[PDB]
Write a protein that binds this ligand. Structure first.
Ligand SMILES: Cc1ccc(-c2cc3c(N[C@H](Cc4cccc(F)c4)P(=O)(O)O)ncnc3s2)cc1Cl
Ligand SMILES: Cc1ccc(-c2cc3c(N[C@H](Cc4cccc(F)c4)P(=O)(O)O)ncnc3s2)cc1Cl
Ligand SMILES: Cc1ccc(-c2cc3c(N[C@H](Cc4cccc(F)c4)P(=O)(O)O)ncnc3s2)cc1Cl
Ligand SMILES: Cc1ccc(-c2cc3c(N[C@H](Cc4cccc(F)c4)P(=O)(O)O)ncnc3s2)cc1Cl
Ligand SMILES: [Cl-]
Ligand SMILES: [Cl-]
Ligand SMILES: [Cl-]
Ligand SMILES: [Cl-]
Lengths: 341, 341
């Protein structure tokens, strides 16, 4: 895996990221204590995932730039912009965990639940966001793609926050008339797909001098469709995934989520089934969760999913055929491989 | 007051700000509901203050640009960038009110305390921040100062968040050994002074083509000192201000704040007085608040303040004399007039 290869160098760079972000403690004694807390926030929240989004920046950059133009400095910058994607993500998650009242994340206590953090985590989340722009300036300010990357990260933030707003309005209070296919697809596009799939490839593209609006729009069309499939599979696996394979155990039903599953169930159910759903969806008690799952099985949603997975795979391959050029198809196929596996 | 003059046109522009931010509902039906919530967030949180910071952008712009170069479009842009300062502020306050567990703000129920908002206000705060960059792009993207303003707002955000972190570490848990003059001045500089005083003049300067680092640094030296005095007076007035004149009633002592007053008190008190402070500071009960106030009076802190106000006034005037050029002194004197009144 081209991801397994760059991974070591990527995680190693994190040390440098932290050092440079905290080096103002050398210019500004007065803020020492705050900079110490920033360092703690970075190490607890930016480390510990799989880094797929950040690494995607580095892999794509290596495929898109002639080897002649990939000097030590070029690659410092790619590792930094990859880490900027991971910091964006850490900003979203710290804030989301507060808003959802989550306990754990990535098999750890959520930052805001830590003794002595609490709602101070809101400012901590904001600093994680701010760090992105500190890093872009420190590493990329003299580059022709500087302003392109600032605007891409700011737009990625807005799209994701819009998606969150839509999600919060949809899944406050237990209600299913909200849980439509058009609304589900909208949430996924704004809240997940733009920042997870479009943003890291887009960033690599700008870094490689590929700034044309048509090329960005072509890549976007492939990448938002990949993001849609990725979330749908995530929603499917939450309930039907082996938890020792996926690393989560699902609470979508307990948590009244607008999951792909419940959207499909509502398209398919009878009035009687609607009731079994309405009576059981979004309860803590486990017998209520068994009865939602059972209804999903009665309606063969696993079969529906596998069908959707196959269709989705043809469609993505067609999209790559038609819209990849002039990027190397491998940019898109490497992603497709990671998620349809 | 040059502020009273521009004020009508400034508040009138808000309608247009909202219209343009919500006009994507015309490109993107799917996100209609989210855009409706954005509109509600903007109207509840961006309206209702005195707009001193935003208006400062417009007044300074009018003093700094030859009248020949102040066309209808120039002024649209100045009103927009003024509103960007007010949106930055609304982002800070919505988030701060959550973190402090405040009930009211500007004589209204805090947004997050509204039925059905709660911690969703965190995402609402983030959208207010995002709106800044939407507006800069929509109104200023073709301008030579575009990237200058993006960087100024992003830096203003970082400085303020750093200041918040320092504040949160200083005033968590009741403790006064933290409450030193050096720490107080650091909090004020980062958390208040950069965004309240430097940011709006700086923005006007870039808009006028004044981008030199020395000119920005000269203006900064005056403006951070003005910001320091403004907070100290705010801290003084909280306890000794007529509330029907100031529009607040003070809770600095109840809330364990690192207020200028308690910093001065700790420099001056005996071991016995320290104890009276320690036993009473940061309690709800009113007899405990009367006894802090009484100690401040025993130590003539009002006299100390008036002395500090006079000194601070000489010093600011000296700074204007020495560092204003080549800006018109009136840029600085208009501010000084608003706050030493
Ligand atoms: C751009 C991008 C974004 C995300 C991913 C992947 C995430 C992921 C993954 N993520 C976990 C969450 C998860 C767990 C099971 C299935 C699933 F789709 C996602 P976590 O965020 O805890 O590392 N787990 C297993 N395989 C993959 S592949 C891969 C790419 Cl190429
Ligand atoms: C770019 C790309 C994308 C996907 C794949 C493959 C996916 C896959 C595969 N995917 C399964 C999903 C699946 C199962 C049945 C039909 C279908 F189209 C897709 P799973 O994620 O369950 O391992 N199963 C067996 N072989 C392969 S080969 C291989 C490549 Cl090179
Ligand atoms: C750049 C800038 C920033 C703030 C101000 C002022 C704020 C202010 C003011 N602000 C109120 C808060 C307050 C209330 C009493 C004293 C004080 F210093 C500040 P609010 O934020 O509720 O409008 N009240 C009375 N006079 C003034 S003058 C003036 C300028 Cl030039
Ligand atoms: C640029 C500027 C700045 C401040 C002032 C004035 C402040 C002031 C003034 N300030 C009082 C504060 C004060 C009270 C005594 C001495 C002192 F230096 C300052 P307050 O805010 O209590 O009205 N009191 C009486 N006259 C004036 S004139 C006038 C101008 Cl033009
Ligand atoms: Cl270089
Ligand atoms: Cl888009
Ligand atoms: Cl024009
Ligand atoms: Cl500074």
């Amino acid at each position: 895996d081209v991801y397994a290869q760059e991974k070591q160098d990527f995680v190693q760079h994190f040390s440098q990221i932290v050092r440079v972000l905290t080096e103002d403690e050398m210019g500004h004694p007065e803020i020492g204590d705050a900079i110490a807390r920033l360092k703690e926030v970075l190490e607890y929240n930016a480390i510990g995932g799989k880094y797929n989004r950040g690494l995607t920046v580095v892999v794509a950059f290596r495929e898109l730039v002639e080897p002649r133009k990939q000097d030590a400095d070029s690659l410092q910058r790619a590792w930094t912009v990859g880490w900027c994607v991971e910091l964006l993500q850490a900003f979203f998650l710290v804030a989301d965990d507060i808003m959802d009242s989550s306990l754990t994340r990535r098999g750890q206590i959520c930052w805001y639940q830590k003794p002595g953090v609490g709602l101070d985590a809101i400012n901590d989340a904001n600093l994680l966001e701010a760090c992105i722009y500190r890093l872009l300036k420190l590493y990329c300010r003299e580059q022709p793609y500087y302003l392109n990357l600032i605007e891409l990260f700011l737009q990625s933030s807005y799209q994701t926050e819009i998606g969150q707003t839509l999600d919060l309005l949809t899944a406050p209070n237990v209600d299913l008339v909200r849980f439509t296919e058009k609304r589900y697809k909208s949430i996924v596009k704004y809240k997940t797909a733009f920042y997870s799939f479009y943003l890291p490839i887009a960033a690599a593209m700008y870094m490689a001098g590929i700034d044309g609006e048509k090329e960005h729009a072509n890549a976007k069309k492939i990448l938002l469709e990949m993001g849609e499939f990725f979330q749908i599979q995530d929603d499917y696996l939450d309930l039907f995934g082996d938890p020792s394979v996926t690393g989560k155990i699902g609470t979508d039903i307990q948590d009244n989520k607008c999951s792909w599953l419940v959207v499909q169930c509502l398209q398919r159910a009878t009035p009687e089934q609607y009731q079994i759903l309405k009576e059981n969806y979004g309860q803590k008690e486990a017998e209520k969760v068994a009865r939602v799952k059972a209804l999903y099985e009665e309606l063969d949603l696993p079969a529906v999913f596998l069908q959707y997975e196959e269709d989705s795979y043809s469609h993505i391959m067609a999209l790559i055929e038609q819209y990849a050029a002039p990027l190397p198809p491998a940019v898109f196929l490497g992603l497709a491989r990671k998620i349809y596996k």
